[PDB]
Amino acid sequence: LLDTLLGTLVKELQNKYTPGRREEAIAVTMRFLRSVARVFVILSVEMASIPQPIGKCKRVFQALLPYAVEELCNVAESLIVPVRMGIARPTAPFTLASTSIDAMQGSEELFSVEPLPPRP
Amino acid sequence: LLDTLLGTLVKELQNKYTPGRREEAIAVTMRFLRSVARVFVILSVEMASIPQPIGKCKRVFQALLPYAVEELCNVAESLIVPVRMGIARPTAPFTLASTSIDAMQGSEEL
Amino acid sequence: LDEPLERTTNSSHANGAAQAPRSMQWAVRN
Amino acid sequence: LDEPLERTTNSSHANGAAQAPRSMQWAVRN
Amino acid sequence: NASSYLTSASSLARAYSIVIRQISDLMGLIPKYNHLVYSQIPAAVKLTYQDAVNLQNYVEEKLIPTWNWMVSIMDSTEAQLRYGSALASAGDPGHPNHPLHASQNSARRERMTAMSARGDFLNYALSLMRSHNDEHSDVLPVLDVCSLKHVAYVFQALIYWIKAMNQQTGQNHPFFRRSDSMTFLGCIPPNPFEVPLAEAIPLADQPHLLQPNARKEDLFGRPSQGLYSDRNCLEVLPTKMSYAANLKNVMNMQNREGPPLTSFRPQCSFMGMVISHDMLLGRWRLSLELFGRVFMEDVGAEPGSILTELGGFEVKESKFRREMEKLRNQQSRDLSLEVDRDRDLLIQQTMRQLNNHFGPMAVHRVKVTFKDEPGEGSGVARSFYTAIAQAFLSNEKLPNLNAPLFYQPGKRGFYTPRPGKNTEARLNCFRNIGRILGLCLLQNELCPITLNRHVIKVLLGRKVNWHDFAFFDPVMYESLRQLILASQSSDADAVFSAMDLAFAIDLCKEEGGGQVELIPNGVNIPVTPQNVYEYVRKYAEHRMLVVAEQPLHAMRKGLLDVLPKNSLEDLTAEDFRLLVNGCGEVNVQMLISFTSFNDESGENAEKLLQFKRWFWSIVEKMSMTERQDLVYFWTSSPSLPASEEGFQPMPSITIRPPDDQHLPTANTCISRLYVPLYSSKQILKQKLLLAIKT
Amino acid sequence: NASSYLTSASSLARAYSIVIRQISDLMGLIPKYNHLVYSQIPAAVKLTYQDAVNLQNYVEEKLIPTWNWMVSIMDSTEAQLRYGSALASAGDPGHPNHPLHASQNSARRERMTAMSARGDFLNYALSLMRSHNDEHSDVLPVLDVCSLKHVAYVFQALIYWIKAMNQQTGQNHPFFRRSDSMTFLGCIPPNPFEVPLAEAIPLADQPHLLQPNARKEDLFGRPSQGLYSDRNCLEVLPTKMSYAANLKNVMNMQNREGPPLTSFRPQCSFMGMVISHDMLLGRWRLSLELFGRVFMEDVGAEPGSILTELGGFEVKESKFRREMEKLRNQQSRDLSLEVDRDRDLLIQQTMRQLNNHFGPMAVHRVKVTFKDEPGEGSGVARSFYTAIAQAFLSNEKLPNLNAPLFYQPGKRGFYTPRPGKNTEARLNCFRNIGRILGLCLLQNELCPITLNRHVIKVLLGRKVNWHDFAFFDPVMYESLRQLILASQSSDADAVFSAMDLAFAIDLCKEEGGGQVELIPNGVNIPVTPQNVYEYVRKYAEHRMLVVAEQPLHAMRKGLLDVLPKNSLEDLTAEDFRLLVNGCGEVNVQMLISFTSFNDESGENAEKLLQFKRWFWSIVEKMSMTERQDLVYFWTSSPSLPASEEGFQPMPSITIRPPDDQHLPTANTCISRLYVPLYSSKQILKQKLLLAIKT
């Protein structure tokens, strides 16, 4: 499924036939790479010092290198802003994950949520 | 003694007769105002929410206004650098001074 | 339940987050 | 005096400031 | 007593604020240098006009990056708070992710333990990455404003410097404009004609919203700011949560003999434009409100604080109470009174004794004694106060020396004076009412007599406007608002020549007679196409200020006989209502927080924990009239004070060894209630309802 | 378990370092994209040459301000540390304000309580204002490097990215150049000819300076950096303590078909110049040393860490010990030995049994049994090890199957092999010595036989240079250094035609005979004006490598018979000395920190506290020979291990109920000493000196 999605994205990125397809595919690739980068950052922070989802994220980054580099630069820039300005929110220390099932258990509660419903 | 020192400094600052006197007096005034600003900052941090030494520092600042403004700007700039870069050294909290004798006792040891 | 049933004599050691309004309570801690 | 006369069993709760060298000991705390 | 980063950051920011205040005080003496400095000190330097301009350029150059830092942080914080307020009014309040949920209270989360540390940091990081590219919809942002104390000192110092430089008809008539008690600084007030009363002045429609912790925004309407689209950063509304984006906008909008010394006038110019502190205060209103709520004990203690100047109820009531205590303990002249429990002889003895006592005052204590009844405690004065309040507010007759004094103009629970062909007796009665309110304010008590907003504003010495008429009679306020709105229609004279109103009005029975003109020449001037604003303002000032001018003057003089003209300064109608009348209705939460629960029975039925729960369920399941009768059984008063400092004895419920034979006893002078321990909840409820009726 | 600013800052910096490492790994695959990515994955994009240059420009643009932040902070920290080191060597050590004082220890200040919080902040602020205008003379700066953990993660990430881009004769002969074990990265080594031995190699002059916590700088000389005057910031030595000044210098020096994809080679360019990581490592050497000392448990655990690659003794000894434990527990083949307490039959039985056992090894345990003596504990093996060490190091004769094996070249306590017309017996003896050292390294014990530095460097497989001759014979090293220094004088042949030395040398009695030539054709070639470097290097390699080549090869093969060629990689002479021979001399502090003080007497003379003080005063007031006899009475070894992990049983002193009748008893296999409680300190001292002699 991952290679199917990547093949569809590359095929629509290499489409210089119909007008407006290339920038549309570029924006779709930016949004997908932002989501993949967020998942990869959460998984890499949760693990200790390669697992299968990190390998899948690395494969996605390698298949779309010149855009993933820019979006990872933006993600790191966003992570490094509150340290340099001295406005970091205080948090409690936590222990790392020796195995991979506990990291999946902790990342399940962060991403499998629902948006706020509207007022009835 | 404070007005004597200030009068000597102003008299040497207004001396356009011998060469090299004005910049020399300017540098002397910068060093003296730096010391006065450091003492004033320590005394004002130690006090709570006017005492006689703070009034003397204010008189010194008012007698030498266009240089004291610049040196106080430098002192504030030096105080505000470690907060903006997020590298402040952690310290323990302390209580303020209701009276003036305890502030003098604490500034004596410094 | 969870609400205390008597005065706690204010217990000292306050950070001012209890004085925040009800609309802005999610933006403060302790 | 001030030096302990036996092992303290390392007591846990370490910040690494005790591992600093003798020449650079004034630049660290705890 | 341990080392922390935030303590050192706050202390360094306080030192920086001290030095910036000193720099501002030094720069403020330039236009009067030769009068204040070069006339007294034997040693001073000579200052020219160009040197002041060079100094101003130097200081404006050396305070750029801290200004950019502060403006970026405050813009991001205000954007996050405004998005939280926007998401609060568009979501389901029953969801646990809603901002107005009980799970979002920080004290309720700590008491529920008796989530994990990894999950909090993961949520903080996920909120950090989503905020960079504006991808934070339907998620409440993660921030802690209580950890931003060092920003507030720098903000206070820069506002101090800006404020120090800055200070050194028909429709456009000053009757339809709100005063300082109903506006916001730097914000556009709502339109008084195109907005209905339900969303313009919600305190007039719902008078029960007045609380000591109530905000200004939900009592007087939602303000608006006209900042959108303009190339400078200060002319655009902050909508982005990212610190990097706001810093980018701030920097991009950044780098986008002569005259005498008296003529030097500095102007604030950071970003190529003139900067006033009013629009800076209006730009960050929510952050300033939260800063004043959480940072008053240390940040608000600085000299020239903007948090103290923008203080709410708790800032002003403490200053008023300490000044009242100082002026009470300044003198040592006592006042004594003897009354009896009735109406006619009570009011006659009250008028006679209050005329005989100073027929400003220096009353130290007030002692009240009931005839043919025992008791010498402090609760006897409170019983006298509520007795004289219900005697003056009752409607039977005038007890000799004829109309009743007060009447309700259309809102339940609020009263205005009735002139009724004012003789010397009615004026003396109103002066006595004002002196009674003055001694009640002096002695830290509550007098349960409620006046309208304009009646309070006459006593405090404030201008009455068109918006005060909504607190007088709301329905004809709305009718006149629709008449103004229809007076500007395209048909013009088609609706004007339908009823043909004149400049004379038919008064009601309480206000007097009827057929009274407003302007000279009387009824012969009908409504023209353009006279309607004048007709409305003459009608409003006739019904609020002309009919009862003498009783209002008498009550103002009676209030001024005891209180000087230095305590009513910087007071408002609402904190006057909260200080004299209390909170109005009786709630359960404050009554829970006021009690002490002294234990003396020594009985250990599951370490109590069930009798107290049954008692508070009985109080929470009780009608408000029975609640007022309950509070009258505690401290002989039908209302609660606004804060803990209004109780000179603390409230106390004290348990007794169990005996199902007697009603619980009351000690009014020490605010104590001795209750015997019972077994059944229904037995407790029946005993309480039998005890409160007396 | 509480909320802190520094934990969140360190966690965010760790996340940033993770993303920067991922960016570096993505950018490293560009020149081999079509082989590694566009040959296996079914979906990939097409990459051109210009897109790689655009990506490199984008990444170099988006990592500027964090680079400026890190460089300014590291420059200020290194300036403060270097000024502290400069003031330490110019002040009075007896003053309490000196850096090398006992009052400056952080653990000693906490134990002394059993200054005020205002004074610490006032000193910090006064150090902050004095550092702005370079007004900080004779005052030690106030800083905490342990609160700078978030800077180290960003520094590690940027060094990772720089290192990833960078990696993707006469006097100038490689004999007078130091190796990697004696140089510093990015620093100029000292001149080997113009500097005397007292301030060039202080470990050679004082061999007692080798400690497990000893620094590299005070063992091998002071390095120097040639950075002064050059307009870029990286070419100027950092001397200013102010963060604002360093940031100002950093910013001012800042803004002062085509080719195939295989030919793309990135170059590091932040500030308009090429940047190597070696000069960045040499620029901040003291900060990196302190970072490796205090931030190894968390910051040093990251993949590709520069702190682990620059690790000292404790990093390498732990890895070596865990690999030794794994290789020991991998196999289950035991070794047994029977010996007797003498010299000749002990060495004969040792040679016979060690030849019979594998005449690589897989020895799991070593068991030693003394003939006509009881005992089967682990201390019997240690007694055998020190017995075979003192038997091999003793100088009487050769016990049949003739010269003694080892001799001292001029430094006391260090030994080199003597060839002595090498037969098959001497070679087998040296192979047995190497195998004995191998089993001693495998079984986590100490063999008290000490070799010179070049003897260790032959076994480890390292090149011997001119600086290794100072550890062989220091006085004639100094004489030859003065001969080199006088060989370049202006008089030239005036001092050359004074002694007229030749290319033949007279050897000593231990090295062999005498009158041995160095080069072919022998004595008929005197010293020319320019041949002196060649004469020195041939003489040095003749006396260190030619005479004893076969014993060194035999010992290398004996060490390699047990240990593979994967554990001696990345080992040095000094940690080999510390792992085999221990610390050498016996100190009091480590012996204090190793003891346990088990109490079983039950006697309460002032809760002890005086017998222990008298005991440690007795140990501290004791001669070193008696200290070695004391340590031989604890664990049957004359030396202590370098760390706590060398003790498989922990050391233990155990008290007894008081009885002044017997000497204290020793249990060697559990490292326990049972001592009876005494009364007098002199009685305790006399009993200890009588017990240690045995």
Author numbering:
A (entry chain A): 1397 to 1445, 1453 to 1523
B (entry chain D): 1397 to 1445, 1453 to 1513
C (entry chain F), D (entry chain G): 1691 to 1720
E (entry chain E), F (entry chain B): 1773 to 1886, 1911 to 1964, 2016 to 2076, 2091 to 2117, 2162 to 2264, 2271 to 2312, 2501 to 2793
Could you give the paper's own sentences about this structure?
Indeed, an L710D variant at the dSBB interface prevented tetramerization and led to the formation of a catalytically active dimer. The N-terminal region consists of an interrupted RCC1-like domain (RLD) β-propeller, with UBA (not visible in the map) and dSBB domains inserted in blades 2 and 5, respectively. The central region is primarily α-helical but also embeds the UBR domain that has been proposed to bind substrate N-termini. UBR5’s C-terminal HECT domain initiates with residues not originally annotated as being part of this domain and adopts the L-conformation. The HECT domain L-configuration is stabilized by numerous interactions. Two meandering sequences emanating from the scaffold—which we term domain swap dimerization (DSD, residues 1691–1720) and HECT display (HD, residues 2016–2076) domains—extensively bind the HECT domain. One protomer’s DSD domain contributes to the extensive dimerization interface within the scaffold, while a peptide-like loop projects from the scaffold to bind the C-lobe from one HECT domain. Meanwhile, one side of the HD domain interacts with the α-helical portion of the scaffold, and the other side nestles in a concave surface of the HECT domain N-lobe opposite the E2-binding site. Numerous additional interactions further position UBR5’s HECT domain, including between the central region and HECT domain N-terminus, and between the HECT domain N- and C-lobes.
UBR5 has key roles in stem cell pluripotency, tumor suppression, oncogenesis and other important pathways. We used chemistry and cryo‐electron microscopy (cryo‐EM) to visualize stable mimics of the intermediates along K48-linked Ub chain formation by the human E3, UBR5. The structural data reveal a ≈ 620 kDa UBR5 dimer as the functional unit, comprising a scaffold with flexibly tethered Ub-associated (UBA) domains, and elaborately arranged HECT domains. Our data show how a full-length E3, ubiquitins to be adjoined, E2 and intermediary products guide a feed-forward HECT domain conformational cycle establishing a highly efficient, broadly targeting, K48-linked Ub chain forging machine.
